[PDB]
A paper describes a structure:
In a subset of nontypeable strains, the major nonpilus adhesin is a protein called Hia. Hia contains two homologous binding domains, called HiaBD1 and HiaBD2, that interact with the same host cell receptor. In particular, the Hia passenger domain consists of repeats of structurally similar domains, including five structurally identical Trp-ring domains strung together by two IsNeck domains and two KG domains.
Thus, the Ile residue at position 324 in the nonconserved region of KG1 was mutated to Met, allowing production of selenomethionine-derivatized crystals usable for phasing by the multiwavelength anomalous dispersion (MAD) method. The crystal structure of Hia307–422 was determined to a resolution of 1.8 Å. The nonadhesive Hia307–422 fragment contains three distinct domains, including the last strand of the preceding W2 domain (βW25), a novel “KG1” domain, and the W3 domain. βW25 lies in the crystal packing interface between two Hia307–422 trimers and forms an anti-parallel β-sheet with the adjacent βW25 strand of a separate trimer. Although the conformation of βW25 observed in Hia307–422 might not accurately reflect the conformation it adopts in the W2 domain, it may be used to envisage the structural transition between Trp-ring domains via a KG connector domain. The structure of the KG1 domain appears to be related to the structure of the IsNeck domain, with the secondary structures positioned similarly relative to each other. However, it must be noted that the topologies of the IN and KG domains(i.e., the way the secondary structures are connected) are very different. The W3 domain in Hia307–422 is similar to the W1 domain in HiaBD2 and to the W5 domains in HiaBD1, with the same number of strands and the same angle of the strands relative to the axis of the trimer. While HiaBD1 has structural similarities with Hia307–422, αIN3 in HiaBD1 does not have a corresponding region in KG1 in Hia307–422, and αIN2 in HiaBD1 is oriented differently from αKG1 in Hia307–422. Thus, two important structural determinants of binding in the IN domain are either absent or misoriented in the KG domain, explaining why Hia307–422 is nonadhesive.
Numbering used by the authors:
A (entry chain A), B (entry chain A), C (entry chain A): 313 to 422
The structure:
Amino acid sequence: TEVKIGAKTSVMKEKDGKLFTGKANKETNKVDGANATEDADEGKGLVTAKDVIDAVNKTGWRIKTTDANGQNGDFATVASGTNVTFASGNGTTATVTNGTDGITVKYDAK
Amino acid sequence: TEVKIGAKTSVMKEKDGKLFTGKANKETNKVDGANATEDADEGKGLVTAKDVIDAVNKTGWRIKTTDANGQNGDFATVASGTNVTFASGNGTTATVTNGTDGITVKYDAK
Amino acid sequence: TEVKIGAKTSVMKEKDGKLFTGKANKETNKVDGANATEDADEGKGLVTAKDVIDAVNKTGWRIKTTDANGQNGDFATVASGTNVTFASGNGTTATVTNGTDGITVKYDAK
């Protein structure tokens, strides 16, 4: 019955919490796409709900982690839905509260 | 004059700062959609600007809050645009600076 | 050969880490769009991959910064991909670890 009309989609790439076109990911970030089409993809195409859901879930800020010896390690992406806890420490007390001015994190010294 | 050609859209669900298809939200997260269509929605459909704006604004990381007694409480979503303050505390001083390496939060002991 | 069928797109605006329709940005945020079309744009239109990539990259949470004298300054947007470091300070030690419960930031007093 119907006439099917194809609308080309574009891919959305992610690296380190940030989104990129297929072309930018290949050319700026030096990450190989799945094929020559992705590598040339300037993002002019449409996207699906699932595409957006998946891409957005990958994004986030980058937090510097520390290693087993407490020294600086790699960044980690604090992606959508990622839990973050500000823990009390030796001789300190952490509180995290929510109000009209947003979130307030605080450390007190014991 | 024109011939109207309908393109089916898909919904984007959110839970705790993360996005989900209608089907995933129902089946993995056990949250009822508005109807059977949403509950079966695998995200193959298109989305509007407003859809994306609204969905993206809901996303964010999750921060552990503390209650009126300073004990661990629920997480809260630090959504797009949410203000976060790192406050100085009893015998501590907070500074938050911005540079080429991004943001640096620091607590000094007085 | 082909018949070209135009699908109207909608713009996605950003302010302070949050997304808005063209109409909302103009009317609620009081920011001029590029033209009368943007200013009336309710987001019913489609978007491209690049549109979503660019808009999503602008979003993030807002962190209160402190100025050259350590006093409260402006907020800054911690956008997708933005690096955040929790630095050890005078008489304190910062650790940031990653586990099954997500990220845990901690300050110990020396």
